[PDB]
């Protein structure tokens, strides 16, 4: 799960253990210096455009 709240990047993962369904806690990946992000690092490319 990838979300962009108030210009910051957050992501949630769903563990879903074998035979179960478990979910990770919220966390925001940050760059080498910091400052978190302003856009989701997921690009969708297509025949027409991106």
């Amino acid at each position: 799960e990838l979300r962009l709240v108030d210009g910051t990047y957050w992501q949630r993962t769903w563990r879903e253990n074998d035979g179960q369904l478990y979910v990770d806690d919220w966390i925001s990946p940050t760059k080498a210096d910091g400052s978190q992000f302003d856009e989701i690092p997921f690009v969708i490319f297509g025949s027409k455009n991106n």
Binding site: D18, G19, Q20, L21
Partner: protein
Amino acid sequence: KIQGLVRPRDPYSNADVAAKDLRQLVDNTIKVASGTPPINIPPSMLRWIQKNP
């Protein structure tokens, strides 16, 4: 297999001998077909206890 493939001969005698032949025998391997009876694996029971179908 030829049984009497060898005959005691006499170089001085001139008496005839009956002939034999090259019989051909055949081996075999029968085919066996097996399978599995239809096993119900509906997703409902696995999903109900929250398990991967």
